[PDB]
Assembly symmetry: D2
Homo-oligomer: 268 residues x 4
């Protein structure tokens, strides 16, 4: 489609000093809210399929729902598997044509995280798919050495580290050091619990992908409640879930602007 | 898939004295609620794509969302275009592989209703797709003569007439007369405003397709409100929209049982 | 894909004084020969699926084989159903996403040709698909009056008439008169039995689609024989059928140049 | 589709004392010849996409051509990647939905053959895809020890060894020893240069997949020559390539019967 590899998309954002919003989708309205936001803002975007939606809707059905809503979309879109803890699941996402995957081995030993992430990375790189991995430790902030050893052992395109969020004060100095030593884009997890000003500075220092989930569901739910609070007998899902969608679309737009990706679709 | 022609499905229900529920879907959760209901009840089912959802989600995207959720479904499923007033729209549904279409020309003159419905019917019949049409009048209840003239001029497989509902007391005698003279299955519109006992008798007299929309959206919305009434800070769409889905699934099950299609999937 | 409506493609050729070659395909190598020819020449092209290949390979399988070979093709391509004599078959081609269809009712009465062609034309026009029809008579050359009456009654986009070929001296004056009175592009059938100079003049006078079948199969067969004449123990289909493909590709290139469509892909 | 995993298909043949023919396809007619042969014989079958056809037609286009001809096929079919020497190519076959792959590392050191084959095997096994590997040596016949070490290090489902053919007298004793020690199905390569009686005995001793390529192309070419020898002006590809197809279909039938898979589709 106008689907683009996550490797290409993130590296471009990192090179040009902005980030890609990685927006978690959970159903039809939420997928559409993200895509319409991106199209209006002329922004590249990632749509994340994470573990919660996979347990509810299925991985391959969500992929197919995204495909269904791409009919009128011309901006760069990358479908990303979020926080996989299974080599098998990661392979399923690769097989149904995702453009980016994350194997999160941060719960494993350093050696095993590296070994499985690396094995997934070799498959992704064979098929032009972006690869994300994550490390915590090998005091609670990842060291340059740990980040470099992880990056080199796995060949991930982009990496998440322990930088001061939780799944909050960002370790800006550390992030700066990581850009110079590791020389790869950084992914922020748990960024919704951090102020906007801090987000902007993290991106200036090398964060090129920012995960957004709860904040979108909060905006969606707030739209729903507002309609149904006013009128509990409003039975048109077009109106109730529709307003949720509009309020979530506005949130996505707000994030796109924060991240600096508005207007960047021309660059691809 | 286990997709089946609407002509086959409705004629079978009519022959065997039960009806097919034609359940209007509006998004991912609502499609899934219908399919899971049908699978659990071992019931043939129609999923309707009507004018409201087409204005919100699009016709072809809804078709593709239904396809996405068929992965584990083995019961007979027929996707039906509801209340089209456009020859063009009806042709679009045929092109993307619907198994039943309705052209509603009941707002047109008798001659023009017949002419357009007939033209759509010739396309549907060329491709093994079920065809529905509707007549009101040519006192507020359709005459046998009108129903026969419409049926013969259009060659519809199943037809809706003015039988005592509104889009309420059913014209049972008239329906009986229509079975003997017209000798085709009847479709009920506006049946949610009619008691269960009346529905059961209409089916005994030849109603073989019963449209259900508002009652499902009411059940969905009631699930949503219940979760969000309890806890407005419940931001998991899996929980809020999920409970809506479960409450809607139960409604579909209730309708399947009313219509008598539970257990009938073996018959196909 | 870079699939384009036949209505668009033919009208453009007619407006600009060139024709589209409508090249009949019969299998994998022959489809590819046409597409590679068109890509090299930067030419719009029609690929025809006609009655012979439908009896051998099937209509929907040929469509899917064309789709398989479009992966690296960027020039305008239109898949056309050739010489259908069945409303049902024409509807099947529409359903699987052809971009042009021909219903040939020239074996029927004038009134019935018009009635069926018109019915197919209404479906095609509903879905942005090009429509071709054919008339002979209502002395062996079609009159302006007959062509105009047929064109007006059917609303075909392009039409074949009896102009001096057989399925040979072209009726150039008649063709000129037809351009001024009917004001639609003309399709030539049986053009392989006519010299190049005559083809060029027919195109100058309004022929905008030229059917090519036998000449391609002759070129293919000549490639095959040449390899197998030299070496009957050449068992590599890559070599034998491959050389057939190369010799057929050259023939297609030759036709593209005759028709004047080389270089015209920029115009779309 | 009625596509079945190669792991399932080969293990079943091995368990029941017959083999699966793995028939190399090169284009539309040759795919169809194999499928029609299998359907008529009520036989499970593998269709191989090997290195020659990949260089001519492409890997993904051949997959899509096979899919196009499955419309009326109900017997078990497995699409297999033959003699890949590239991890990347093997991953491409996995991604487009092959049901069996072979990584041939027999040109590499033992350690590197094992390492790459194993890595491909982990991906295949994650997605329920059959895995083949090959070993020669670590005098020209593979030892039990070598076969066991290779089998254990890679976890292939089925394996090719050096058993007395060339890419000829079969090493029956060795094959017997391999069944008892390795306890996996064996794949024969280069079996066309071996008599039928020898093939039957190899299958009795554990050969459960027999590759067939040249013999089919020889049968196809012989059909072609026969038509074109008689009549060089026979330009109907339906007749010339058609007769090739019929003569190749008969060859496939002959192989199915040799291998003992005729009638075995019921067993699945
Ligand atoms: Zn995270
Ligand atoms: Zn994380
Ligand atoms: Zn209605
Ligand atoms: Zn109605
Ligand atoms: Zn012709
Ligand atoms: Zn003709
Ligand atoms: Zn081999
Ligand atoms: Zn080999």
């Amino acid at each position: 489609m106008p689907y683009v590899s996550g490797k290409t998309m993130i590296q471009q954002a990192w090179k040009h000093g902005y980030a890609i919003g990685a927006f978690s989708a959970h159903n039809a309205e939420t997928v559409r809210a993200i895509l319409l936001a991106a199209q209006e803002e002329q922004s590249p975007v990632m749509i994340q399929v994470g573990q919660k939606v996979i347990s509810v809707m299925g991985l391959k059905p969500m992929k197919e729902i995204i495909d269904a809503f791409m009919h009128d979309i011309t901006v760069p879109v990358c479908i990303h598997l979020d926080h996989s803890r299974s080599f098998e699941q990661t392979m399923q996402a690769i097989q149904c044509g995702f453009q980016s995957v994350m194997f999160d081995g941060s719960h494993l030993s350093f050696e095993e995280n590296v070994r499985i992430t690396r094995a997934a990375s070799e498959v992704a790189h064979a098929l032009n798919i972006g690869m994300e991995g994550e490390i915590g430790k090998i005091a609670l902030i990842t060291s340059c050495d740990e980040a470099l050893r992880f990056s080199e052992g796995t060949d991930v395109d982009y990496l998440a580290v322990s930088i001061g969020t939780a799944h909050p004060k960002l370790a800006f100095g550390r992030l700066q050091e990581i850009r110079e030593i590791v020389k790869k884009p950084i992914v922020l997890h748990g960024g919704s619990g951090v102020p906007d000003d801090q987000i902007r500075q993290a991106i200036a220092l090398g964060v090129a992908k920012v995960n957004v989930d709860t904040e979108l569901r909060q905006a969606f739910t707030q739209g729903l409640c507002e309609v149904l609070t006013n009128d509990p007998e409003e039975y048109a899902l077009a109106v109730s879930l529709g307003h949720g969608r509009d309020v979530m679309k506005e949130k996505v737009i707000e994030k796109i602007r924060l991240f600096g990706s508005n207007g960047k679709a021309l660059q691809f």
